[PDB]
C-alpha cells in the first residue's frame, strides 16, 4: 500500500524510532519521476503534426461515388486515429505505473544494501533495525551515508539473541 501522510513528494521514507516518527520524501528520485512523466505527456502532445484542412460536403446528388470515396477516407482515418490513440494511452499507462514501481524498488534496494544484516527485512517494505537508530542515524540512511561498522556489533549480538 501507499501513504496518505507523505505530502512533500512521490517516493520516500517513514521512520519509527525513540524521538517520534515521521515521513520524509526522497527529493531527487521524486523530481526524476516528475520530469519523466512530464516529458512523456508533452511528447505525446507535442509530436502531433497539425495542418490546415477544410472539411465539407461539396459533392452533388450525381457525384455520390466520389462522396463515397471521401467517406471511406474520413472513416478510415477516424479508425486509424481512434485505435492508435486508445492503445497508446493503454500502453503508456502500463509503463508509467511500472516506472513508479521501479523507482520505489530502487529506493528499497539502495537502503537494503546499506543495512545488510544490521536490520531485518520485514517483507512489507519495512526494515526492522537490530539496534538503536536515532534521528541522525535515520537521516544517514536517507542520504546514503549510513555507516555499517558503527552498529555491527550491537546488531551482531541482538541477532544471535534470536
Amino acid at each position: 500500500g501507499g501513504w496518505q501522510g507523505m505530502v512533500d513528494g512521490w517516493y520516500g521514507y517513514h521512520h519509527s524510532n525513540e524521538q517520534g516518527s515521521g515521513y520524509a520524501a526522497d527529493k531527487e528520485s521524486t523530481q526524476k519521476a516528475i520530469d519523466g512523466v512530464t516529458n512523456k505527456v508533452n511528447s505525446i502532445i507535442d509530436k502531433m503534426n497539425t495542418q490546415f484542412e477544410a472539411v465539407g460536403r461539396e459533392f452533388n446528388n450525381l457525384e455520390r461515388r466520389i462522396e463515397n470515396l471521401n467517406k471511406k477516407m474520413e472513416d478510415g482515418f477516424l479508425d486509424v486515429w481512434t485505435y492508435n490513440a486508445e492503445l497508446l494511452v493503454l500502453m503508456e499507462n502500463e509503463r508509467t505505473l511500472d516506472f513508479h514501481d521501479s523507482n520505489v524498488k530502487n529506493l528499497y534496494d539502495k537502503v537494503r544494501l546499506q543495512l545488510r544484516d544490521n536490520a531485518k527485512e520485514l517483507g512489507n517494505g519495512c526494515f526492522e533495525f537490530y539496534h538503536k537508530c536515532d534521528n541522525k542515524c535515520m537521516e544517514s540512511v536517507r542520504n546514503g551515508t549510513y555507516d555499517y561498522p558503527q552498529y555491527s556489533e550491537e546488531a551482531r549480538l541482538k541477532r544471535e539473541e534470536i
Binding site: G1, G2, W3, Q4, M6, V7, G9, W10, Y11, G12, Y13, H14, H15, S16, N17, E18, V37, K40, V41, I44, I45, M48, T50, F52, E53, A54, V55, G56, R57, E58, N60, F77, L78, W81, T82, A85, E86, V89, L90, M91, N93, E94, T96, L97, H100, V104, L107, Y108, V111, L122, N124, G125, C126, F127, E128, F129, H131, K132, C133, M138
Partner: protein, 320 residues
C-alpha cells in the same frame, strides 16, 4: 524497537485509468488528452471573419435574389457559412452551372468587390424594366435578381446584341449571365419577337453557345420557365464578347476577385460570436493544444485529430 520503511504518495483522488493489462485502476493524478469542449460559436479564422449567409444560398447572394437584400459589404472572408436549407436560392427556377466548383472557388477570398460593368441605361434598343416575376418578389411586389438583367423586346423588336467588356481592372472578374428557357412559341415571340434564338459568349478561353429549350415543364415557384446561369473568370487584360437575339439574361454587376487560398462551405445554424479561432466546427470553435478531439468531423482550420472516444486519460501519478 527501531524501524525504517520505504513508501509512496497517496491521496483521495478517485481518478481512474485503464492499462493494457488492467482496467479501472485508481490513481493519484491523471491527465485527459481528449479535447471535448468548444465555445458554442462561429468565429473568425486566424483573424478573418466568415461570410455568413443566413437565409441565402451562395447562388442567391451572388445573383442578388431580392430576398438577399442584406449586403453588408465583406471585402474578404476565410470561409462561408450556409444554413442546411437556405430559403432564398434561385427565386426564378433553373440552374447555376458548375455551382459546386464556384462555391469552392468562393469559399475563401482575399478581395471581393462588386462593380457595375454594363449599366442598365446602356441598353437603348431593348426593354430593361419589364423582366420581373412574381417568383422573385421584393416587398411583396414582382422583381428579379439584382445583378443581372432580363432583357425584353422593345417596340416589337429584339435586334441582335453584340457587346464586349474589357477587364481594365487589375483583378480577375467573376462574371455571370444566363439563358431563359421559354415555355412555347407564343411566349417566345411575346418576350423576344425572334422565334429561333441563341447566345454566344467568347473570351480568350471561353467559347460558349446557348440555345433555349422551349418545352413543357412542371411549375416551380409558380413558373414553368427556367433560367440557366453560367460564369467565367475574365483575366485582367481580356475581353468577353456577348451576342444574342433573345433569351439573354445579361450581366449588369460583376465581381473583382483576388484568390490566394482555399477553404470550403460550412453548414451551420449558429451565430457569429465576435471571437477568433484556429479551428472552427459547425457547432463551435475549438481552442486547444490537445492532440485529439471528439467534437465534430466537419472542421475547418488546424485541428486535433478527430476520434471516436469519450476519454483519453493518461496516468501521471501512482496507484491509489
Amino acid at each position: 524497537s527501531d524501524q525504517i520503511c520505504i513508501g509512496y504518495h497517496a491521496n483521495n483522488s478517485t481518478e481512474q485509468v485503464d492499462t493494457i493489462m488492467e482496467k479501472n485502476v485508481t490513481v493519484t493524478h491523471a491527465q485527459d488528452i481528449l479535447e471535448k469542449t468548444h465555445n458554442g460559436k462561429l468565429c473568425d479564422l486566424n483573424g478573418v471573419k466568415p461570410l455568413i449567409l443566413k437565409d441565402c444560398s451562395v447562388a442567391g447572394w451572388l445573383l442578388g435574389n431580392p430576398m438577399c437584400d442584406e449586403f453588408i459589404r465583406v471585402p474578404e472572408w476565410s470561409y462561408i457559412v450556409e444554413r442546411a436549407n437556405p430559403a432564398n436560392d434561385l427565386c426564378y427556377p433553373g440552374n447555376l452551372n458548375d455551382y459546386e466548383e464556384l462555391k469552392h472557388l468562393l469559399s475563401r477570398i482575399n478581395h471581393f468587390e462588386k462593380i457595375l460593368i454594363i449599366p442598365k441605361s446602356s441598353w437603348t434598343n431593348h426593354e430593361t424594366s419589364l423582366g420581373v416575376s412574381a417568383a422573385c418578389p421584393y416587398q411583396g411586389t414582382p422583381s428579379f435578381f439584382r445583378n443581372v438583367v432580363w432583357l425584353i423586346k422593345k417596340n416589337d423588336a429584339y435586334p441582335t446584341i453584340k457587346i464586349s467588356y474589357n477587364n481594365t481592372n487589375q483583378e480577375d472578374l467573376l462574371i455571370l449571365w444566363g439563358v431563359h428557357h421559354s415555355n412555347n412559341a407564343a411566349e417566345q415571340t411575346n418576350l423576344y419577337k425572334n422565334p429561333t434564338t441563341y447566345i454566344s459568349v467568347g473570351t480568350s478561353t471561353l467559347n460558349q453557345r446557348l440555345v433555349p429549350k422551349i418545352a413543357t415543364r412542371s411549375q416551380v415557384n409558380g413558373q414553368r420557365g427556367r433560367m440557366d446561369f453560367f460564369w467565367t473568370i475574365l483575366k485582367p487584360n481580356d475581353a468577353i464578347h456577348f451576342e444574342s437575339n433573345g433569351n439573354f439574361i445579361a450581366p449588369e454587376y460583376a465581381y473583382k476577385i483576388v484568390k490566394k487560398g482555399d477553404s470550403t462551405i460550412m453548414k451551420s445554424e449558429m451565430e457569429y460570436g465576435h471571437c477568433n479561432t484556429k479551428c472552427q466546427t459547425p457547432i463551435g470553435a475549438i481552442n486547444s493544444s490537445m492532440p485529439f478531439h471528439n467534437i465534430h468531423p466537419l472542421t475547418i482550420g488546424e485541428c486535433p485529430k478527430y476520434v471516436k472516444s469519450n476519454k483519453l486519460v493518461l496516468a501521471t501519478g501512482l496507484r491509489n
